[PDB]
Amino acid sequence: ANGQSTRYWDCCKPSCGWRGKGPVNQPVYSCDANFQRIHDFDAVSGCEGGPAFSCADHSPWAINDNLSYGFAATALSGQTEESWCCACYALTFTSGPVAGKTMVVQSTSTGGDLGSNHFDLNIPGGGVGLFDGCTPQFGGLPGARYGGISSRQECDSFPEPLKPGCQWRFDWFQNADNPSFTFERVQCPEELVARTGCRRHDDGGFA
Numbered sequence: 409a410n411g412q413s414t415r416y417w418d419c420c421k422p423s424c425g426w427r428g429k430g431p432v433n434q435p436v437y438s439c440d441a442n443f444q445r446i447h448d449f450d451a452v453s454g455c456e457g458g459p460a461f462s463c464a465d466h467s468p469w470a471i472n473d474n475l476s477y478g479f480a481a482t483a484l485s486g487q488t489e490e491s492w493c494c495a496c497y498a499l500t501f502t503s504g505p506v507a508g509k510t511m512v513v514q515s516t517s518t519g520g521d522l523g524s525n526h527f528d529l530n531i532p533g534g535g536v537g538l539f540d541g542c543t544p545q546f547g548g549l550p551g552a553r554y555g556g557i558s559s560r561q562e563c564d565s566f567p568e569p570l571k572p573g574c575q576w577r578f579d580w581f582q583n584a585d586n587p588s589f590t591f592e593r594v595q596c597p598e599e600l601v602a603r604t605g606c607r608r609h610d611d612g613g614f615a
């Protein structure tokens with residue numbers, strides 16, 4: 409399949425962080441203002457004036473020079489959350505400075521695009537976007553509303569837990585701006601499930 413991407417980090421509780429979003433063992437973990445895991449999956453989102461924010465460990469990272477693991481807010485043409493929550497997809501970039509690189513990402517939230525295959529990649533400092541839960545969480549992140557910061561050095565003022573994800577963007581990712589990609593759903597690697605805690609019942613069917 410073919411799709412396009414954007415990047416973001418709004419500190420909001422992930423949509424797949426609520427129970428009943430799909431056949432899973434447990435939904436995606438949420439974190440408190442101090443980036444620590446929360447036990448209550450029914451907690452109010454930090455973007456709804458509540459205490460449930462996005463976990464900093466739900467950041468992208470490089471496995472090797474050709475592959476990275478990550479997370480994204482997804483929207484698939486003619487599909488619903490039930491079919492993508494916690495599902496993993498192997499993306500192979502077809503444009504940008506990272507063309508040819510692969511990245512396996514787990515869907516932890518939902519984007520607002522309709523009629524398209526869109527992956528809004530979780531990237532600290534990639535842009536708060538529509539919602540801003542980072543201001544309530546810890547005073548906010550620097551950068552333009554969409555797209556976020558423009559220089560790696562800007563990651564220096566970020567809360568410690570968000571720095572590596574922020575920097576990953578200017579390293580493995582070579583600051584690629586909205587690269588397009590081909591993608592197929594694949595079984596979620598153990599490392600991703602270990603970060604979110606969420607695994608789909610139909611996951612084993614994939615390879």
Ligand SMILES: OC[C@H]1O[C@@H](O[C@H]2[C@H](O)[C@@H](O)[C@H](O)O[C@@H]2CO)[C@H](O)[C@@H](O)[C@@H]1O
Nearest residue numbers: 420421422423424426453454455456539
């Ligand atoms: O709780 C209202 C509504 O929330 C949806 O999840 C939110 C998430 O909590 C928020 O942090 C993010 O920024 O937006 C999404 C979508 O509004 C959830 O998916 C719904 O089931 C729930 O009723």
